[PDB]
Each structure stands twice: as structure tokens, then as C-alpha cells.
């Protein structure tokens, strides 16, 4: 079938070496959207930050923050699918006996909890988190304490439902392990030249570029630009 929607990992694929947004990626997105593609952004950052990207970059589909746990829709509303009461409590307790600590953007989180942590405390905190029904991983600017199942697969399935699409009509763009949840779905897949080996191995198209420059080549490959 033909690709009608592309779900893209913001931090993993739309930024350069210094985490700045790629202007070439922005123009590729706008070009593809003008030709009819619906684009959705997926990020671990907070919803007002992803909302800023939606209104300034010119994204025509819903955008997700907190790794899929919260969404800003095209009707201008915000819907969250998970709560941060449990994850916030966990951080509060864990910060008393480990280096796990809150980050400024948590003041805008609603469905999960971001944090910083010393590498030495990662294994212990992960064990404690999983024993409570949570998971931890790094993305973008920080670690993320998420509810099990609050991931990119949840978000992509939600987009599929919202647009009444088949999996083969969806293209996902990611770069690493924290994207495998959506890369393991029956969707179309593409990634940058610096994507992990496992992500490349399941991708339909592996770009010769990275740091935002893969967006244009990927879209061209699928005749979206």
C-alpha cells in the first residue's frame, strides 16, 4: 500500500550533533506534507515542547510527548493516557537513597517522570522500577521512568486507530533501541546511517545520511517528496 503517515522520533532523527533541529529535515517535512503526507512527531520531552515544534515546524498530525504517554491533537486538545502519580512517588523515594534526581522539565510532565542518575545507580534503580511496573531508558535530554507499555508502539497504534489506517500505510523513522517498539510493528521502516545494527536489520530503507539529512532521502525513496 501507499504511505499516508510518518511517525518520527524527534530527538533521534530530527537533530544534529549538538541537538539542534535540522533545517533540512524541517524543509523535507514541509515538502512531504504539501504533497499529502501526514506527519506525527514522537518525543520523550514534555507536551508544551512538542506542541512548540508542532506549531513552529508546521506539523500536520498529532504530536506525542513523554514517549507516547501524552498527545496534542489536531482539535487543539491534550489527552494523556497514563499518570505520573506512581512514577513521581517512585522518584521521590529513590532520590533519598540513590543519585536519582528530578529534572526541571518534570514541572510540565503529566504521564511519566524524567530524571538524571549516576551510571553506577542505573542497575539498582532499573530493578526497583521494574518491580513496581515501570521501566527506565534514556532518550533526548534525560532518563525516563515510564509505565510499562507507555511507548512508541502505543503511540503508533493510536495514530493507526485515529486515521483508520493499515500498518503498511504507516512509515516509522527511528534510530536506536528506544524505537524498537515501533520498529517491531508491521509498519514500513526507515533509519539513518548511524542507526543501531538491530534497527537497520529490520528497516525497509537505511539512509546514507544522519542528523536530519536522512529525512529527505527517506521521503524521496518512498516517493513522498
What is the smallest separation between the CB atom of 60 and a copy of itself, expressed in angstroms? Answer: 26
What is the smallest separation between the CB atom of 58 and Ca ion, expressed in angstroms? Answer: 20
175 is in an annotated binding site: yes
Per the CB < 8 A criterion, the answer to whether 68 and 178 are in contact is no
Neighbours of 123 (CB within 10 A): 9
What is the smallest separation between the CB atom of 42 and Ca ion, expressed in angstroms? Answer: 9
Q: Give the interface with Ca ion as residue ranges (CB under 5 A).
A: 9, 11-12, 44-46, 49, 105, 140-141, 175-176, 178-179
44 binds, among Ca ion, a copy of itself, none (CB under 5 to 8 A by kind): Ca ion
Q: Which residues contact 139 (CB under 8 A, 6 or more apart)?
A: 11, 12, 43, 44, 67, 178
179 is in an annotated binding site: yes
75 is catalytic: no
Per the CB < 8 A criterion, the answer to whether 115 and 139 are in contact is no
CA angle, 14 as apex, 12 and 17 as ends, to 5°?
A: 75
> Can you tell me the distance from the alpha carbon of 43 to that of 108, in angstroms, rounded to the nearest whole number?
14
133 is in an annotated binding site: no
The H-assigned helical ranges of 14-134 are 23-34, 47-53, 85-94, 122-130
What is the smallest separation between the CB atom of 44 and a copy of itself, expressed in angstroms? Answer: 17
Helix (H, G, I), strand (E, B) or coil at 63: strand
Q: CA 179: distance to chain centroid?
A: 7
Choose between 2 and 104: whose C-beta lies nearer to Ca ion: 104
48 binds, among Ca ion, a copy of itself, none (CB under 5 to 8 A by kind): none
Answer left, alpha or beta for residue 88, where phi above 0 means left and psi between -120 and 50 means alpha. alpha
202 binds, among a copy of itself, Ca ion, none (CB under 5 to 8 A by kind): a copy of itself
> Can you tell me the distance from the alpha carbon of 127 to that of 41, in angstroms, rounded to the nearest whole number?
30
Choose between 61 and 69: whose C-beta lies nearer to a copy of itself: 69
Choose between 54 and 160: whose C-beta lies nearer to a copy of itself: 160
Q: Give the interface with a copy of itself as residue ranges (CB under 8 A).
A: 81, 130-133, 148-149, 151, 153-154, 157, 181, 183-186, 197-198, 201-202
Choose between 17 and 96: whose C-beta lies nearer to Ca ion: 17
Instruction: Indicate which residues carry an active-site annotation.
Output: 9
Bind-site residues:
9, 11-12, 44, 152, 175-176, 179
Amino acid at each position: 500500500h501507499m504511505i499516508r503517515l510518518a511517525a518520527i522520533d524527534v530527538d533521534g532523527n530530527l537533530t544534529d550533533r549538538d541537538r539542534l533541529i535540522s533545517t533540512k529535515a524541517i524543509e523535507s517535512i514541509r515538502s512531504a506534507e504539501k504533497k499529502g503526507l501526514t506527519v506525527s512527531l514522537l518525543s520523550g520531552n514534555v507536551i508544551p515542547v512538542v506542541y512548540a515544534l508542532k506549531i513552529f515546524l508546521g506539523i500536520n498530525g498529532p504530536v506525542f510527548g513523554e514517549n507516547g504517554g501524552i498527545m496534542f491533537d489536531n482539535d487543539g486538545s491534550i489527552k494523556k493516557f497514563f499518570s505520573n502519580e506512581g512514577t513521581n512517588k517512585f522518584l521521590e523515594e529513590m532520590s533519598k537513597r540513590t543519585s536519582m534526581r528530578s529534572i526541571l522539565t518534570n514541572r510540565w510532565r503529566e504521564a511519566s517522570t524524567g530524571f538524571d542518575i549516576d551510571p553506577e545507580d542505573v542497575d539498582y534503580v532499573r530493578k526497583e522500577a521494574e518491580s513496581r511496573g515501570f521501566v527506565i531508558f534514556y532518550s533526548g535530554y534525560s532518563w525516563h521512568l515510564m509505565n510499562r507499555g507507555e511507548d512508541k508502539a502505543f503511540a503508533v497504534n493510536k495514530l493507526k486507530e485515529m486515521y483508520s489506517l493499515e500498518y503498511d500505510e504507516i512509515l516509522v523513522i527511528g534510530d536506536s533501541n528506544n524505537d524498537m517498539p515501533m520498529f517491531q510493528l508491521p509498519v514500513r521502516k526507515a533509519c539513518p546511517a548511524n542507526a543501531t545494527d538491530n534497527i537497520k536489520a529490520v528497516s525497509d530503507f537505511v539512509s546514507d545520511y544522519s542528523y536530519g539529512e536522512e529525512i529527505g532521502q527517506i521521503f524521496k525513496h518512498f516517493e513522498l517528496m
